[PDB]
């Protein structure tokens, strides 16, 4: 089968440079033109640029005009998207899609075989470990029924971090929220479980986080006051 793959994405600085590779396995780039589609995290799809390797008529979007550039090589069967002076708005997932040439049926077919898409981010903050803080149920009031018990992790970079409860034991009632972007550049995430009040003073609950780039493993305890 024919498909696409994207490489060269990671973390950069604002005002830096980054080159992205779009490799098409199967078909050649002289028989189908290539396109770039931006998807901000939480927003929808939006278009960036294209290239047609037959003639070359590269036109850009209004937000990336005169800042990005594109160049496709048919010997290596790939397309390079070079970006310099990156703004903070360009933190997004880039998809590299195929689309056919006029005339015929492959023009009326849309972007049929999308790629997996790479992730690019523009941030000024550096990498650090998540500070973990407990969230006690405050059992002096609102007792009798169920209660909640939480962990607030904050001030970490980059994105991926995992939060587990009792090293994977307590997994029925775990709500892990997505990482929301704090205005100071870092990230803050919350996690919480539902514990009945009868066992809340009996079972000792621990809370283990795992941050893979900044290799720290903070395993704290969560208990009421």
């Amino acid at each position: 089968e024919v498909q696409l793959v994207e490489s060269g994405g990671g973390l950069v600085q604002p005002g830096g440079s980054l080159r992205l590779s779009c490799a098409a396995s199967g078909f050649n780039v002289v028989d189908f033109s290539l396109h770039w589609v931006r998807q901000a995290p939480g927003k929808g799809l939006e278009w960036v640029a294209y290239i047609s390797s037959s003639s070359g008529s590269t036109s850009y979007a209004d937000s990336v005009k005169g800042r990005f550039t594109i160049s496709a090589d048919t010997s290596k069967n790939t397309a390079y998207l070079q970006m310099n002076s990156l703004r903070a708005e360009d933190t997004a997932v880039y998809y590299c899609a195929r689309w056919g040439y006029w005339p015929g049926e492959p023009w009326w077919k849309a972007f049929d075989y999308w790629g997996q898409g790479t992730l690019v981010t523009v941030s000024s903050a550096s990498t650090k470990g998540p500070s973990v803080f407990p969230l006690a149920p405050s059992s002096k009031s609102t007792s009798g029924g169920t209660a909640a018990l939480g962990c607030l992790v904050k001030d970490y970079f980059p994105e991926p971090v995992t939060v587990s409860w009792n090293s994977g034991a307590l997994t029925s009632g775990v709500h892990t929220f997505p990482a929301v972007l704090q205005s100071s550049g870092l990230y803050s995430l919350s996690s919480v479980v539902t514990v009945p009040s009868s066992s809340l003073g009996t079972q000792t609950y621990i809370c283990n986080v795992n941050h893979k780039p900044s290799n720290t493993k903070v395993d704290k305890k969560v208990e009421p006051k």
Binding site: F133, L135, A148, G150, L152, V192
Partner: peptide, 21 residues
């Protein structure tokens, strides 16, 4: 509702949260 723990008052930044489940 969750008030901050004893560590955020010594760190220098407090954080209250409210949960809707």
């Amino acid at each position: 509702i969750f008030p901050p723990s004893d560590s955020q008052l010594k760190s220098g930044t407090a954080s209250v949260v409210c949960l809707l489940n």
